[PDB]
Amino acid sequence: AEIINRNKALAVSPLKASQTMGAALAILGLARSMPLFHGSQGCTAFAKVFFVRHFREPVPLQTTAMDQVSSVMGADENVVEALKTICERQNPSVIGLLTTGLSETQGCDLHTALHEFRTQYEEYKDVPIVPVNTPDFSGCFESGFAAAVKAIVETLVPERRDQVGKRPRQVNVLCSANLTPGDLEYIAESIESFGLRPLLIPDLSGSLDGHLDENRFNALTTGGLSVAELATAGQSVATLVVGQSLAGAADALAERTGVPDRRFGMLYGLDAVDAWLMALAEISGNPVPDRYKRQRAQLQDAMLDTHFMLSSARTAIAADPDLLLGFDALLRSMGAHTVAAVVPARAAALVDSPLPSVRVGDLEDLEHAARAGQAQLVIGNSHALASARRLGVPLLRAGFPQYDLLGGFQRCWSGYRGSSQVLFDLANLLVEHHQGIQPYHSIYAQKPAT
Amino acid sequence: AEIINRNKALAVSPLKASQTMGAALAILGLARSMPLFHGSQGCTAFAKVFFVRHFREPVPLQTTAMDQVSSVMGADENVVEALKTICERQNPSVIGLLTTGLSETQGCDLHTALHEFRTQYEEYKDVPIVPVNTPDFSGCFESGFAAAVKAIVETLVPERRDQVGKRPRQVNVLCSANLTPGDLEYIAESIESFGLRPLLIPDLSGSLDGHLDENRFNALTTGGLSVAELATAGQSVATLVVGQSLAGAADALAERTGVPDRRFGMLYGLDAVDAWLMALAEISGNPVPDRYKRQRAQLQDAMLDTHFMLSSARTAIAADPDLLLGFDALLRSMGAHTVAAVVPARAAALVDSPLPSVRVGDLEDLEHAARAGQAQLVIGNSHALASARRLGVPLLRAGFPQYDLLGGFQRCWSGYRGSSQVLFDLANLLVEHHQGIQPYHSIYAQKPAT
Amino acid sequence: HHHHHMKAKDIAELLDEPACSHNKKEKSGCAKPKPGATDGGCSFDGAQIALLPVADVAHIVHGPIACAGSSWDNRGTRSSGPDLYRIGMTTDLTENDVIMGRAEKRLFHAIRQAVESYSPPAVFVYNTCVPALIGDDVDAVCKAAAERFGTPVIPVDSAGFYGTKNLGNRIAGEAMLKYVIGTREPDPLPVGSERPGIRVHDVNLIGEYNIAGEFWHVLPLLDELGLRVLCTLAGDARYREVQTMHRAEVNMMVCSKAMLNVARKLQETYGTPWFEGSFYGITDTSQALRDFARLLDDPDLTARTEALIAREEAKVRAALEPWRARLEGKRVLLYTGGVKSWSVVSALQDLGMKVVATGTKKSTEEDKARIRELMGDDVKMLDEGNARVLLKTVDEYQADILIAGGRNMYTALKGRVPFLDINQEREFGYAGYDGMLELVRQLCITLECPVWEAVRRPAPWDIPA
Amino acid sequence: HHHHHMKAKDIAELLDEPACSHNKKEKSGCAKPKPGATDGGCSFDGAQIALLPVADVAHIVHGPIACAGSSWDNRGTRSSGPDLYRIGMTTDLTENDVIMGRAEKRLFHAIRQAVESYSPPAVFVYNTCVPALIGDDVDAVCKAAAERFGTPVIPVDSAGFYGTKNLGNRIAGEAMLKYVIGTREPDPLPVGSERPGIRVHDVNLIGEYNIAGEFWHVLPLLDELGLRVLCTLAGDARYREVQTMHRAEVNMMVCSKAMLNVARKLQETYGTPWFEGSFYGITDTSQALRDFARLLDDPDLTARTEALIAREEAKVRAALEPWRARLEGKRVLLYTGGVKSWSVVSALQDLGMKVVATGTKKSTEEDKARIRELMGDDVKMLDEGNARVLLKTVDEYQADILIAGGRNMYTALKGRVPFLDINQEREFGYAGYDGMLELVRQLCITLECPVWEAVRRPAPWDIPA
Numbered sequence A, B: 001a002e003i004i005n006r007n008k009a010l011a012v013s014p015l016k017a018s019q020t021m022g023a024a025l026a027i028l029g030l031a032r033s034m035p036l037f038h039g040s041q042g043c044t045a046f047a048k049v050f051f052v053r054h055f056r057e058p059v060p061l062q063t064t065a066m067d068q069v070s071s072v073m074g075a076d077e078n079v080v081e082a083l084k085t086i087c088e089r090q091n092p093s094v095i096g097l098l099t100t101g102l103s104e105t106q107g108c109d110l111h112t113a114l115h116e117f118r119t120q121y122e123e124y125k126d127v128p129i130v131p132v133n134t135p136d137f138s139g140c141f142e143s144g145f146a147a148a149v150k151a152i153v154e155t156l157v158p159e160r161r162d163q164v165g166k167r168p169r170q171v172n173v174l175c176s177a178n179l180t181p182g183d184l185e186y187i188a189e190s191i192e193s194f195g196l197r198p199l200l201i202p203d204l205s206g207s208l209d210g211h212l213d214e215n216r217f218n219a220l221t222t223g224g225l226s227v228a229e230l231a232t233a234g235q236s237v238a239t240l241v242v243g244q245s246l247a248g249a250a251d252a253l254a255e256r257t258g259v260p261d262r263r264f265g266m267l268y269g270l271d272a273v274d275a276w277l278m279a280l281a282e283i284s285g286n287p288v289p290d291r292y293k294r295q296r297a298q299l300q301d302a303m304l305d306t307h308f309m310l311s312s313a314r315t316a317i318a319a320d321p322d323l324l325l326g327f328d329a330l331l332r333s334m335g336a337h338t339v340a341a342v343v344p345a346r347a348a349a350l351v352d353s354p355l356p357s358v359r360v361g362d363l364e365d366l367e368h369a370a371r372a373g374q375a376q377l378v379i380g381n382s383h384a385l386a387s388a389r390r391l392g393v394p395l396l397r398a399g400f401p402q403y404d405l406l407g408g409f410q411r412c413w414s415g416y417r418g419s420s421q422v423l424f425d426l427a428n429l430l431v432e433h434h435q436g437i438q439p440y441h442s443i444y445a446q447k448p449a450t
Numbered sequence C, D: 001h002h003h004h005h006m007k008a009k010d011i012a013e014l015l016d017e018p019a020c021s022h023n024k025k026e027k028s029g030c031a032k033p034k035p036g037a038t039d040g041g042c043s044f045d046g047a048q049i050a051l052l053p054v055a056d057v058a059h060i061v062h063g064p065i066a067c068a069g070s071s072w073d074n075r076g077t078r079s080s081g082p083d084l085y086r087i088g089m090t091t092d093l094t095e096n097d098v099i100m101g102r103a104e105k106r107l108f109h110a111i112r113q114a115v116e117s118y119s120p121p122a123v124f125v126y127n128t129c130v131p132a133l134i135g136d137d138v139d140a141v142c143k144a145a146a147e148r149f150g151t152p153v154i155p156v157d158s159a160g161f162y163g164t165k166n167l168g169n170r171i172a173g174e175a176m177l178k179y180v181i182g183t184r185e186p187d188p189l190p191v192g193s194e195r196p197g198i199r200v201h202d203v204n205l206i207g208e209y210n211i212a213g214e215f216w217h218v219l220p221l222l223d224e225l226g227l228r229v230l231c232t233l234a235g236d237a238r239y240r241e242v243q244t245m246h247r248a249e250v251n252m253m254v255c256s257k258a259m260l261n262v263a264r265k266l267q268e269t270y271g272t273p274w275f276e277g278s279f280y281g282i283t284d285t286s287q288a289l290r291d292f293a294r295l296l297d298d299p300d301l302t303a304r305t306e307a308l309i310a311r312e313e314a315k316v317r318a319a320l321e322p323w324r325a326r327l328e329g330k331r332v333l334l335y336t337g338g339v340k341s342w343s344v345v346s347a348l349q350d351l352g353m354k355v356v357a358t359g360t361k362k363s364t365e366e367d368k369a370r371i372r373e374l375m376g377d378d379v380k381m382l383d384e385g386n387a388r389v390l391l392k393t394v395d396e397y398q399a400d401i402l403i404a405g406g407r408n409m410y411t412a413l414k415g416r417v418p419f420l421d422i423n424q425e426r427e428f429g430y431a432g433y434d435g436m437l438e439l440v441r442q443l444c445i446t447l448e449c450p451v452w453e454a455v456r457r458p459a460p461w462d463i464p465a
């Protein structure tokens, strides 16, 4: 696809979410973790509202509290004071040190401020701090997340090569931003069905899955990927990559451990799930279970029954590049055309797409592109509802944020059954909104006026 | 509950579906089976349209073709000619011989017409024929289904007592009409997770699950409960009964096998699923898996996050007694009140209900009752859409038929995850429809001509 | 019983149709069905299919829940106002009603309840198998109810066991001729409708059911020509329109031969000339409009009819040209399941598609005559209702798509073959010139679909080495 | 930098509020936050929370996506017409805009695009951290854009690092006083609104944000009394209403002290008398209406005010009586997170509920003064933002429900404790006499819920023998 780059001065109804938030989401996929924004209190407050409204769960998130004075005079002391405060009050398993636009503009070198804390408070030497440079003016929520998985891999995984296959059934999985806690459950369970032991990096299905913990109060993430388990990354037989956005994190993991990888997009549709199960069968040596063979025949049937409504359907998608490419492929197997594709920022994976072009814009740009292309349905987040209502078309919620849909944060989109439910939902919206031939009132009719 | 019995001459917008159809559905839950209605061609044609539109799959269904002459002079020969025709053309594993209102009015004794076929066509002695007296003027779809499982148990299960436990890990499951192919998959998988071996009687998740079979053409059911496997019901350690409607089939199985049973209503809500998993843990000796322990905490979270919208919510339900009692208990755990409850026909289980009264009636009665009670939502089949539009409230589809919703036939309402999704759907319907404080326009306002 | 011998006499009178060309033949459409090998609907289904689209009427089904409970709100018709016909109405007879003979009382109070609750222009009562077998005088109950409550109650005596769905359509037409037609004069031409130079002629459209609102493509053409449709039986129809059918100048038989008793009886009784035709395809829509001018003896109408045809044909041929390449030469297998399948054949001819039509021994003689007309006089009939024979026929002729009624949908879908529905349950309109555009869109939708290669390709584990 | 020293001088002038009683105290609300232990919002947030309900204005956020991208379309306000405030508008600065100093050019063309595409009455431009640090003269850009495009551009210089959300409310008020208020005379009284015996008085409602349309329960009462609200700042407000605020006769401070600079400056500049009050609860709504009559010096208004109070109090006390038993004696723990929590305390008093109010060292001095007023002079403050301390306080006082801002919702929900939201994000209105009914309904909804016993009871497998 030809990327129609950002051009206008004003972003109207922003599709994009900050890189800092995406990186915080990746940190949130680690057990007993605390994400820390190096910046003013407001960035963290907005991020907390964003995640609390989407997951409908408490979200750990702190700030270095950069004020007017520390923003000009220098804020490295605030970083040291925040690390010490979190280490003593909540005693974390891991801390994520993420930068904001304000800290990058000032010139705060992460590796200087972190070093100073390490030399002043040696009592917290064993608490790993993942440093990641994610200023708000660059990239997006998805690329930010992927940049945090790279920093996580470089900070909590040891640099070795001689241990590949030490845990013979173990298989790493590098997960992307748009993999919901329900998508992660399908990945882990499908892997487990082949006898393999999944190692999800990171694991949001343990922290933000939407469960009531045993403890009345938790200050850190109630679960997710443990740093103890993450150190056993070199010991695995293979690393599966789910989502093209993690190419940089897959290379970082491959160079540091030597564990060979197979790369995938979103596990949406007959061909993406076929290739997922084929790799698993080849890795474990065991055949594809009968359970997944039955679900393939069930997807083939849902494709037959929803072909009538989805073949030739014109859709408009406003989502992260992984979701765009993952939904386009699912729709392309059905004969449905993506007539409008809007991403929040550029992505290398977009260049290798069958779409004739993809725009880097906002929801206002989506509304105009969909209207030009005569879209019949929009696929986007809670913010896209107002654009869909102005267009007169139904919405199918997908991605962050989902503040207006209960349980939407945990929807499993992946696999045969998860892919089947997307076909039923797109078909059902399309049918419910289809207005047929309008009544014609004859000028000679014997119809009573009253 | 105190039953308000049918009193009006005209059933307007019928809730009830025939006893014959429900019995055919139970026969459809048997592998390579052909249901046969003893009556005119039209009963079968309407039943075929009913099931084809709900499941969106081909449905095996035959008729004895009773015409004007055979309806007055007698139609036992038509029964013999139909059994021979199906045995030679499709060679079935089992045939269901069900009667209509027309055959019962004439006085066709099933055990005479079947005997004559057995003495004329001895070449088909090994093809079991399940006889069931199902006239359209009596009972309903749910009780009719329950009658066919009783006849199935009496025809394909041997009359022994000395074999209880011969299959040590095998546990019988008596399934009711409203258990979707999705509910049946949760039942089988939950049982399998305890190391146990499920034996589903009948099994619609094998025939009408919505799968594309290997064969290009099938004349009978592509799967379900085999007669070979059904004969091993006496060798099972325990029999679980899912749905109060199958009390008569549970007694028939208990007298003939001696296998002890535990009875359940719908597997809906915190308490019904708790009791389901407790019985399984006690039977197998193994504890409740961590997977189901996590889903209980997820249900508790789903009940916390939806309490705001579901506590005190007034609902109107028009469904079979097993669905009514299953949904009332689910809603009662949330503080939601069923202010209107309409069933198609009487049931013993209704007498033992926490509701003050339940009406036997139709969808017109539902609209009248919901309007009196000030209902905010309606739970009911696709026919209940018009009642809900006339009432001005959302509808949550449940029960047969679901001709307007793709994939509705396979929804899993059962389990912790199944109960959470009902809560999110009721909460989302209630939120989307909630009209807040309406704008007041001041007579002194400085607002430009709005 | 002696009452049932006189009913079988009336059935033979309906099957004796002198207006049809196959009257001197062995009636194959209405032949004794094979037990354990039947697929069609009953006479009750047939009469309700023809009278349900009379939108404002109370449609009461007299019988147990098997009849109405499994069949209600499934008419592919569209209404422009009233929707009482969508409400399921049935006596829902209990065991005690059949045994104690309490069904006439139950029906009588059901008409009363319908009149009181909904105040309709009329009530149609449909008879079913159980009340026809038992002593149930539906006619006398309806007569008594009409008198006591002041609302016309018309009895359609069409129990399921009388015959096929086609017989029900005849009984429905008979009920209209006997109780409704001729009971009210047409309304005067609406004020403001006076178009100078246009002579308004009154016509009837018998057999048009407005499936998915398709007649709303033809209705504007008739309006432009100055043709007042007194009644479209029964597409978007009202009880008051049906009463005036006797005062039509010309009658049009739309894609039907089961309603031929209506056109014939209206010509014998009121002298109204009639013609057979269709609104499916360009050639058929234009021929239907040309036949109206031919029988109305108006040169001004004839000249304006040619002008409408030249305008609508220029517009539709231009719109079909960008699609012409995409559907040219595609093989179509048409199956006639007594669901008026031959009417859409003419539309497929206007696209350059070779169609292979096929039928069975249980099909009507008109279905058989149309197959000899196109395929040849030595054609082969499928005979039995075995769907595997129909699937084999698809592969035999290298068919690209199967066009048949909705019953055979899963035979084609599960057999991995593209299918197009042409029954009284579809959601797309194919009538008139505008309908041709929707037909090619639906044909391309299923034919150009990538879903077919996906369901034919095997699983990646079931691939040999 | 020397530009940043002059900005910190203006901030100290805003914190010096002589109209407040706690001016000679150590400003605890606006105190240096603890790193790694902070929960509040930034000045930009408070500025937007104050001016975003000016519904018809183009609210462009100048800065990177962290500011607007995470915060747009999340105002609990309801408008009666225009909704341009709901559209997210931001400069979405790139790295190159910050480095090359191209942000002023960016902002200038962003105002142009907003004016051309949406034609608003005015554009408001909110400064954020990044543009404030690199210098960006937001005022001069707005001034230039106002002149070149003909639409008023109002700069709201409130970068997040200046302080808390409360400071943003002061900066928002300052921006209105300096650029909007006093720029247009009120409209003449609408035609037909003449009511003999009624003298129409102009008032202003400062601090009413119409959360869930709750002000549409007070607006009819003001209307009945003959009080023209010139502007409700900013509930369901339009730019043209705000311009006329200088011509009000009386000003009402609604549940706020951050906007106290507005009421004081309007009394110093235009001589407009003001009063503090609330519309939460029966006693408060009636006191607010009584204060209006007291300052408007009209005996006819005073008499009609008593008549409205006697009517509305009789209706609401009668409606609250069937509920009176269900909420009597229920223990309420109120937490003050600077989200104007003390305003709803008076409503809970009208129900017979003993409330235990608590705050922290980071809370404002007014929050602390109201806690000494009810709990006692020797009260204990929580100090840190640790939520386990708040949970312990619930169990200590045997609290039945926690009433606090939406931030503390999951602390109470996860701690198995009933909660009621009282923040600028709720969907239920509690203002006026009518709002009291909704408050008791929401309190009963969560308190009488069986979900609480279910989440406290252990799993059936975690029960010993």
Ligand code: SF4
Residues within 6 Å of the ligand: B039, B040, B041, B042, B043, B044, B046, B102, C042, C043, C044, C045, C063, C066, C067, C127, C128, C129, C130, C159, C160, C161
């Ligand atoms: S009329 Fe007869 S054949 Fe038709 S549905 Fe009723 S009982 Fe069945």
Ligand code: SF4
Residues within 6 Å of the ligand: A039, A040, A041, A042, A043, A044, A046, A102, D042, D043, D044, D045, D063, D066, D067, D068, D127, D128, D129, D130, D159, D160, D161
């Ligand atoms: S104003 Fe500052 S603290 Fe607030 S959101 Fe913007 S950058 Fe973050």
Ligand SMILES: [Mg+2]
Residues within 6 Å of the ligand: A055, A056, A057, A210, A211, B301, B302, B305
């Ligand atoms: Mg939650």
Ligand SMILES: [Mg+2]
Residues within 6 Å of the ligand: A301, A302, A305, B055, B056, B057, B210, B211
């Ligand atoms: Mg299917």
